[PDB]
Structure formats: structure tokens, C-alpha cells
């Protein structure tokens, strides 16, 4: 009976349920409405979500994340060779050509396929819904990026099966976001929908057409390496240089633990800057027992990220060009992904679309799970959302 919608995200995952036409996004044990797509292995336990992300800087080698960049891929693909520089954990190729993530768990060397790591994230999201409902959950709709190939979709479905879920369907993330806003029901006639999805690691723009309750992905573009983590890195690079000017050329970047601790505080300041004009980045005993403190204005953050923010419009122009349509022909602009909370990004998109207000009523990092939950309820025979 009970079916959930799961956004299996690169950096964060989210679980929703649609009952009586109402969608509840379910909070985890820590009260978080999204859960990090992190899995860590220690001498005693296997941590998933918040607990895994929280100990990442203390256990870099055995804390896995970014499995979505490896799922359904051959280890030899150029994408894997390029991305692996960003991972403190070890990834090797198996005799079947599949990636094998190598960690230490309880003093033993263990290997996992990307779909096994993703199955642990999915199992945690299943448990988050189960704790809320007080009942077991078997059915689910899981989302994937529109550009995911058959191998990536099938490996994501397999991750669901391993997690104990009966995957009703694998659907596209941009389509799930459009379904969340009821754009398939609302009004009538052909509608051109632009989904602007800027998450923690990726940027995806998708141009959809909707005629008679049927969504079609006309064109997609973006950048698989542009997200919130790149804006955090702009703050990290600035702080590293600021520390040098304050402490006679001392270089924080030589210590990877100092960088990780600084990155944690840079991301917190970035979030504050979405609703405040200023924020403080503070790390006690950052490097060589030296305390670090700096005040960052929203203007300074905007300046450090200026080119990256403006360049988000390039894939918007590209999808419009590929779909052979003018920006004036876009009926709805849906903001998806946690980074769309950045005021400058919202302003740039609004100005590009000549003052058109983007649809952002749903928490952008929840809209995909919200749409997947609606689709899960429809596929279970519940027509109340319509
Ligand atoms: N209030 C906020 N302002 C700026 N950035 C924010 C934010 N709230 C969340 N974010 C960013 O959103 C990113 C995560 O986005 P989300 O949509 O949940 O994850 P995902 N797996 O789709 O990448 C992180 O980089 C985080 O810093
Ligand atoms: Cl249901
Ligand atoms: Cl309930």
C-alpha cells in the first residue's frame, strides 16, 4: 500500500509521502528535512547521513560520498578519472570494469560497488519514512538526472532493490520538480517549463514541454562540476589568502584537516549570507594553534563568485537554443537545489527572464522528492493530488 518518493541526490537525499493529496517531506532523527548522501565506516560502526558527514574530516579515507558520480559507470570512463582527484577515499576498477570503493570497517578492508553505497543511503531514507509512519514501507519512486543513461538508471533501480524497496518507477529529476508544482494539471495547452537545478555539486538546466498531462524533456544542459561546493571553495581560497596576510605568509592549504575544518565554516557562512548581509567565519586553532576569524559581507561573497553565478545563465541560453525557442516562451521557471536560495542567483535568473518571478514556493532542495512522492501516490492508485 504505502509508497514514498525519494530524491537520491549527489550530496543530499530527501524522502516524501503524498497522502490525501498533501505531501509531507519527512525529517530524519536530527530534525533535518534532507540527509547527506554519505556513508562512513569506523572501527565499530557503519554511519549513514548526518552522522557520516559529521565525522568526515576525522575519517576521510573511510567516509564515502559522490557515489552518484560512479553509479552505473565503468571505472575506465573519463568522468571517473577526472572526478577521483576530489575523493579522499580509494576507488579501484574490478575485473568486471565496475568501480570498487575501498574502505576499512572494523579493522578489515572492505569493497563496495557504487550501487551498494547508494543502497545504504536509500535504506536510511526508507527508515526515515518508516519511523515517521510507524509502519514498514516497500514501494518507492526514485529520481535520477534526465541525462542518466540506461546503465546509470538500472544501477539506481538495483540500489533500491538492495535497500528492500520495490521500485515502482525511476523518473527524471526535472520532471519530478515540475510535477511537484502541479504544472501537469494547472491551466491547459502547451507549457514550456525551465527547471534550474543548482545543488551541492551539479548544475542542471532542463527545458520541458507539457501538453495534455504529458511531460517531455526537450533539451538539457549544465555543468556536472558547478554547485554549492564550488562557492564554498571560493570562500576557502579567500580565507587561505587572508590567513597568509594576517600570519606572515603561513599556508593553511598545506594541512588537509585545516582546509576541511575551514570549508565546514565557509559553507555555514554562505548559508547565513542567503538571509543576512554579513556572516563570520571562525575556526579556533585552525593551523599552528592560530585562531582564525573574518567577517564576510554578502557583497564580498557575490564578488568572489561573480563569474560562477553569471555563468549559470550560459546553460540556460544553450537549452533555449537547442530547443529552438525564445526566453519569452518560457511559462514557468522552477528553482530546484539548495544553492537556488542564494539571492544573487535568484536575481540573475529573474533579470534574464525579463522580470518573471521563478516558482520557489517549495523548498528547492525538497521539490524533487515532493514530485517523486506525488508520482508514487499516483502509481499506487491514489488520485487525491489531482
Ligand atoms: N540557504 C542556503 N544558501 C546557500 N546555499 C545553500 C543553502 N541551503 C543549502 N545550500 C546548499 O545546497 C547544496 C545542497 O543542495 P541540495 O539540493 O540539497 O543537494 P543535492 N544532492 O541535490 O546536491 C549545498 O551546497 C548547500 O550549501
Ligand atoms: Cl501512498
Ligand atoms: Cl503520520
Numbering used by the authors: 33 to 418
The publication says:
A single heat-shock 70 kDa-type chaperone, PfHsp70-x (PF3D7_0831700), is present among the parasite proteins exported to the host. Hsp70 chaperones comprise an N-terminal ATPase domain connected by a short linker to a C-terminal substrate-binding domain. ATP hydrolysis triggers conformational changes in the chaperone that cause sequential binding, holding and release of exposed hydrophobic segments in target proteins. 233 chemical fragments were screened for binding to the ATPase domain of the Hsp70-x chaperone from the malaria parasite Plasmodium falciparum.
We noted that all residues forming this pocket are conserved between PfHsp70-x and the main human erythrocytic chaperones Hsp70 (HSPA1A and HSPA1B) and Hsc70 (HSPA8); however, residue Thr111, which is located within 5 Å of the bound fragment, is substituted by valine in the human proteins. Thus, although a challenging proposition for ligand design, exploitation of the Thr111 side-chain hydroxyl group may offer an avenue towards increasing binding specificity to the parasite chaperone. To model this effect, we refined the fractional occupancies of the PYZ iodine and pyrazole moieties separately, resulting in iodine occupancy values that were lower by 66% and 33% (in chains A and B, respectively) compared with the pyrazole group. We noted that although crystallization of the PfHsp70-x ATPase domain was performed in the presence of a non­hydrolysable ATP analogue, AMP-PNP, the resulting crystals trapped a hydrolysed nucleotide plus the leaving phosphate group in complex with the chaperone.
